[PDB]
Design a protein around this ligand. Structure first.
Ligand code: WXX
Length: 167
């Protein structure tokens, strides 16, 4: 038993809710919140900009130190950093950005990072400003992640569509 409320169960291990991930994180305080990161951990907009704003820019300060030490992430890769006031940990995961021409096949690799964590609160990778089809992203999620994932979908209209079209 865990503290997530109001989710619709899609599969054995995947759940979905129309929610603002920042507010969900603020209430649940999950062990892991997933950020929709880029390779530079520049949290300017989308999910990342919202999460970072909610940390009063502490996420960005920590991220800049990480990059200065380690260099950029790989597309499809991840790193674990602090969750600040939102979660114990933040798993920064880089899905491909279609608006940058990156290979959508890397979306499966991106979701594989979730399997290193028993339970996660997450957005749909490569959705939103990353330019992928959120329905495809949901399919890859369901077919790749084996751990327990609670997906927060900000847009109510999108949410209805994802549910109604789910196979
Ligand atoms: C990481 C990508 C996801 C995609 N899913 C969305 O719902 C985005 C809203 C529209 C989706 C349909 C039209 C474009 C925007 N983006 C977020 N997912 C959860 N929470 C969030 N907060 N801010 C962004 C965001």
């Amino acid at each position: 038993v865990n503290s997530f409320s109001g989710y619709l169960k899609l599969t054995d291990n995947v759940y979905i809710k129309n929610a603002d991930i920042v507010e969900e994180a603020k209430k649940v305080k999950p062990t892991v919140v997933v950020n929709a990161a880029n390779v530079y951990l520049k949290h300017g907009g989308g999910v990342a900009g919202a999460l970072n704003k909610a940390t009063n820019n502490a996420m960005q300060v920590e991220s800049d130190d990480y990059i200065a030490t380690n260099g950029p992430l790989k597309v499809g890769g991840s790193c674990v950093l602090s969750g600040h006031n939102l979660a114990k940990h933040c798993l920064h995961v880089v899905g491909p950005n279609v608006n940058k021409g990156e290979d959508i096949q890397l979306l499966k690799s991106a979701y594989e990072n979730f399997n290193q964590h028993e339970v996660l609160l997450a957005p749909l990778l490569s959705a939103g400003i990353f330019g992928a089809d959120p329905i495809h992203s949901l399919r890859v999620c369901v077919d790749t992640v084996r751990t327990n994932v609670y997906l927060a979908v900000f847009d109510k209209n999108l949410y209805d569509k994802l549910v109604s079209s789910f196979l």
